[PDB]
Design a protein around this ligand. Structure first.
Ligand SMILES: Cc1cc2nc3c(=O)[nH]c(=O)nc-3n(C[C@H](O)[C@H](O)[C@H](O)COP(=O)(O)O)c2cc1C
Ligand SMILES: COC(=O)/C(C#N)=C1\SCC(=O)N1c1ccccc1F
Ligand SMILES: O=C(O)c1cc(=O)[nH]c(=O)[nH]1
Length: 363
């Protein structure tokens, strides 16, 4: 009922009336106030996952970017996400790029963005999270954890120090932290995925994390691009093993423009998300799982809009999945839709639960 009305009526109307940045701001506001269908799907036990030091009631999370500044956390749980990731947050506030900076490709079920880390900054977000810190502590205990994704300011003269500052300020408020070294929209950032740069950066990040007190000590994940060479992937895996990085987020948006895109806006500069990214991301997950011998948890992201897409990533090696762009097209009912379909497919394929399907294609 709801899935059809949103997909066929509400979302096309919002899109017809509002440019995508305005529509996103409205969405953040509505979600922050809880103006959502409170989701009727009740998570079954087959969807629970234990990973990263935590219980996850379901494996479907909201990807970084939708709640950049931590304004809508509780609304996102209400929407039925198993986990929420906020950010990217940068140390100092910054505006990001000039508008327009986000573009719909509806013929492709895709988006292109070049926000450039618009961020309220660490201090603002610190105080927003602290206002609900114990409400989160209870949510985390009940199987609903919180991730915090860290970025770098545009004019920073020392990237590693930007990340270290994020660890110190928001680490104590997060169940996991993400070192985002894969935005395509900050000059030079993606060079931090290079072996020597990444080793130096992550050694500093881990030292800062390990300095936090035990109950305030988050897991640390690295978020990587879908456009890496084979050498780059191998190098990342090696570093993740050498340093004991807790996990990987696979993938960010692509700077590629796959053949076949139809949208008028396909040649706009920025990272591409949604359906055209899906299988490039799945493949990246598959490679990274193999390279790390299945011993490094992966959160899989890029083009998930169905239960089949979720399960493909899980079977490829993801322990958890995230989505963003599917919301622009299908709206909030897509969350329940993914979960219901995933549970149905797990049963059909003879898995006892999600946990049994992680990496199943490799076996
Ligand atoms: C508008 C927009 C903004 C985003 N901003 C961030 C970000 O601040 N940090 C980050 O790590 N990823 C960011 N992402 C990437 C998403 O987290 C995700 O990796 C990507 O969009 C693929 O998932 P999807 O196809 O489900 O949207 C952003 C994506 C979009 C569409
Ligand atoms: C005029 O805008 C709305 O009616 C929205 C929005 N945005 C509504 S009504 C119920 C609902 O869920 N949303 C919504 C919330 C977040 C994302 C997309 C949405 F359509
Ligand atoms: O702020 C952005 O431009 C953003 C950051 C990121 O990591 N990924 C992305 O697609 N956009």
């Amino acid at each position: 009922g709801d899935e059809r009305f949103y997909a066929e009526h509400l979302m096309p109307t919002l899109q017809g009336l509002l440019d995508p940045e305005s529509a996103h701001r409205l969405a953040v506001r509505f979600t922050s106030l809880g103006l959502l269908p409170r989701a009727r799907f009740q998570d079954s036990d087959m969807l629970e996952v234990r990973v990263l030091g935590h219980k996850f009631r379901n494996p479907v999370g909201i990807a970084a970017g939708f709640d950049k500044h931590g304004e809508a956390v509780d609304g996102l749980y209400k929407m039925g996400f198993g986990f929420v990731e906020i950010g990217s947050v940068t140390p100092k506030p910054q505006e990001g790029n000039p508008r327009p900076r986000v573009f719909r490709l509806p013929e492709d079920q895709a988006v292109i963005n070049r926000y450039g880390f618009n961020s309220h900054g660490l201090s603002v977000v610190e105080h927003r999270l602290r206002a609900r810190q114990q409400k989160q502590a209870k949510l985390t205990e009940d199987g609903l954890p919180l991730g915090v994704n860290l970025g770098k300011n545009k004019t920073s003269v020392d990237a590693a120090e930007d990340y270290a500052e994020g660890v110190r300020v928001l680490g104590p408020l997060a169940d996991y932290l993400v070192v985002n070294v894969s935005s395509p929209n900050t000059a030079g950032l993606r060079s931090l995925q290079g072996k020597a740069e990444l080793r130096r950066l992550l050694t500093k990040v881990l030292q800062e994390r390990d300095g936090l007190r035990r109950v305030h000590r988050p897991a640390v994940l690295v978020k990587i691009a879908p456009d890496l060479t084979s050498q780059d992937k191998e190098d990342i895996a090696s570093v993740v093993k050498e340093l004991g990085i807790d996990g990987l987020i696979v993938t960010n948006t692509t700077v590629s423009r796959p053949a076949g895109l139809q949208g008028a806006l396909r040649s706009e500069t920025g990272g591409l998300s949604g359906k055209p990214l899906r299988d490039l991301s799945t493949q990246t997950i598959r490679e990274m799982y193999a390279l790390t011998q299945g011993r490094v948890p992966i959160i899989g992201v890029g083009g998930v809009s169905s239960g089949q897409d979720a399960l493909e990533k899980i079977r490829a090696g993801a322990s958890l999945v995230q989505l963003y762009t599917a919301l622009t097209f299908w709206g909030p009912p897509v969350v329940g839709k993914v979960k219901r379909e995933l549970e149905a497919l797990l049963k059909e394929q003879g898995f006892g639960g999600v946990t049994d399907a992680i990496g199943a294609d490799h076996r």
